[PDB]
Amino acid sequence: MGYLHRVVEGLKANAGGEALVSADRRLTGAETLEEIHRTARALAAQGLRPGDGVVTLHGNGVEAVVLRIAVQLLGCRYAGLRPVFATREKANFLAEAEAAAFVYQPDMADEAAELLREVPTPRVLSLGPAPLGEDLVALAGAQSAEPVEFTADERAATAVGFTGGAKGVCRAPFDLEACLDASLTIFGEGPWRFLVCIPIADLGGEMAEWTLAAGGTVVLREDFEPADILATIGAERTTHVFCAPGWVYQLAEHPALADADLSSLTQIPYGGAPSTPARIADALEKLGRPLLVHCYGSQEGGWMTWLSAEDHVRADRYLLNSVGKALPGTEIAIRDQDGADLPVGTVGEVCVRSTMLMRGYWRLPELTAKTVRDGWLHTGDLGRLDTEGYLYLVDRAKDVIIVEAYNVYSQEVEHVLTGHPDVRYAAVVGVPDHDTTEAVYAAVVPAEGVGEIDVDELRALVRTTLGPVHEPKHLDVVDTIPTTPRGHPDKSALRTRWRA
Ligand SMILES: Nc1ncnc2c1ncn2[C@@H]1O[C@H](COP(=O)(O)CP(=O)(O)OP(=O)(O)O)[C@@H](O)[C@H]1O
């Protein structure tokens, strides 16, 4: 009965219990709810009204979550810059935003001034003592904690999340409550004790709101470092920590895992980037129980599928190369070049329809209309369904390797390679071929205790599984697979390195 209603009621149900725990500060539900009201009235006092854009620049402090909710409670449009983003990318976003306020962490006051010289914004605000603008925690300090009722259009965008090259995904309460609803399906009923070490600016902050909504406790960390995270799980008695798949491996392999206490976890949901099945298998063996839950989502589509914990260890199937089944209410069609629905089993673009679809891309109505067509999000992912409804991603459309007019799917070839015991990690990419236009390059990282990889054994296994053309013409053993700023392997830089 309204997205912020859901958040607030969650905080009212957790009034006396912890709600926001960072390493610096701890609020109850009642304390948390009080800061939100006072922050919201403070922002209102500064002139912000429904529809006004509030760009922010902060880490994952407590103050960041109160800010996100308070801005949205007013009905304003929260637009959170990740810290990780290059400063130029931030400016371009801040400029694109019809920004009515800019709210920054003191710690980051340098960057604030570079961006604000570059985009003069009114209502510069600081989350504590700071060189620039007024101090918002002070302003809230002197404000009443009287509840502020959400009264804006549930359908109008209250959040914008940035995705690089470089786009803001707008979200309204409507689609956010549906995202909330899906989270309860994935993560189970609340209350959760949820370890968020993802930016509050974007996905970490929605996950914060979901946790609170379901009446739970957000445990904030700035980022993922496996040793801190293992300590935090036991100390803060976490029920969930959302991981990039690499992070999952870092936990499961970390020497201090043996001394850590993980008994509090119900789940370790993971997603955001392609997993290595064999590695998820090892993580599963090393953790000792079905904790892992595979989540497939996008900022545009919200949650699309999840592979449950039980399906990770289902006796009669191997499903670790699946991102699982549709969430209740999510329809999935697999479509060809022209938008024809393909029969179950065939490869095509994953197109999803649900009430979780974004409101659309910020100030990009053309691109919106190319991406969402007749209420169907075209994901740019390629995959197939199976007769039990599991989704298998084989490639991003942009990564497909065209050899002699046949389609080689890079992600699908990696899984074959990584499935090999001698291979730990792999990246497949297309490079120029005189004869076949594009040939298949695979870089493979050897497992521990593997010496010389038999590159012919590996080509055979791909031929034998996918067929001849899927065979890597070029097969480098490497130390390391380069990575992009945002959890994802750097395919450009392998294309780039392979020429020279
Ligand atoms: N569990 C999973 N397994 C494989 N690919 C996944 C995945 N979850 C997400 N993806 C991939 O990553 C996409 C999700 O990206 P978005 O949420 O839109 C931006 P992002 O990956 O966070 O990058 P950004 O740094 O530009 O924000 C999907 O459309 C799909 O290609």
Residue numbers in the entry: 1 to 165, 170 to 504
Please give the exact wording used by the authors of the publication that reports this structure.
Amide Bond Synthetases (ABSs) actively catalyze both the ATP-dependent adenylation of carboxylic acid substrates and their subsequent amidation using an amine nucleophile, both within the active site of the enzyme, enabling the use of only a small excess of the amine partner. In this report, we describe the activity and specificity of an ABS from Streptoalloteichus hindustanus (ShABS), with a broader, complementary substrate spectrum to that of McbA that includes enantioselective behavior toward an expanded range of acid and amine partners in amidation reactions. The requirement for large excesses of amine in these reactions has prompted investigations into the ATP-dependent amide bond synthetase (ABS) class of enzymes, also members of the larger ANL (acyl-CoA synthetase–non-ribosomal peptide synthase–luciferase) family of adenylase enzymes, as these catalyze both the formation of the adenylate and the amidation reaction within one active site of the enzyme and require only one or low equivalents of the amine as a coupling partner. In common with other adenylases, McbA features a larger N-terminal domain coupled to a C-terminal “cap” domain.
